[PDB]
Amino acid sequence: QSPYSAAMAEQRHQEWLRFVDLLKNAYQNDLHLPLLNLMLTPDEREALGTRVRIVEELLRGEMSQRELKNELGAGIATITRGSNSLKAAPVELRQWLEEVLLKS
Amino acid sequence: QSPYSAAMAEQRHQEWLRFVDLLKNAYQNDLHLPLLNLMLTPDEREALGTRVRIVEELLRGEMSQRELKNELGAGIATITRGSNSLKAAPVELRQWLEEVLLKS
């Protein structure tokens, strides 16, 4: 009956969902300040900024003149690669990213 | 001598708040799954299950039966650690947490 989307594959992942969801609950009511600040940790601190970067870059980065991700030698390091991403991770990002940066 | 270099409002905290703000938007529905994958970094992949481990073991006052500890061989330290914040005032967490672990 209609496509109804085919079946997907899944494995060990009991907390990564039910709990990670609670993370969004604290957020909403901007009540994440405490929780968030809870497990900050230095290592992570130098990550948030390096995080918002990739996003605002992948989209608003292909227009930079100082060349921060086009020709730096070490810029395209792990900002995009990360650990494991072939041709099914980004095709899933463009989905939302379009609504927040483009809004249309 | 800064012939035209001037700041707009100085400070920078704005970003850290304007960015995470976007994180919420994605969640809202289920649009965080994609960007959520950009968060599968190794370092974070191990800090995830942990992020939920503390909070849970903290308010364990809910008659925790099989949630006291899941890694005795090694990992019970990141929990019974203590106050890692110089301010030593997690009372800011009991605010939301008390509403997420118990919920009226």
Curated annotation (Swiss-Prot), chains A, B:
Q: Which domain of life is it from?
A: Bacteria
| Residues of the DNA-binding region | 65-88
Name the principal localization, coarsely classed: cytoplasm
What are the record's GO terms for cellular component?
A: cytoplasm
Which family does the similarity line name? Belongs to the TrpR family.
Q: What does this protein do?
A: This protein is an aporepressor. When complexed with L-tryptophan it binds the operator region of the trp operon (5'-ACTAGT-'3') and prevents the initiation of transcription. The complex also regulates trp repressor biosynthesis by binding to its regulatory region.
Spell out the subunit comment: Homodimer.
Name of the protein in question: Trp operon repressor
Q: Give the species.
A: Escherichia coli (strain K12)
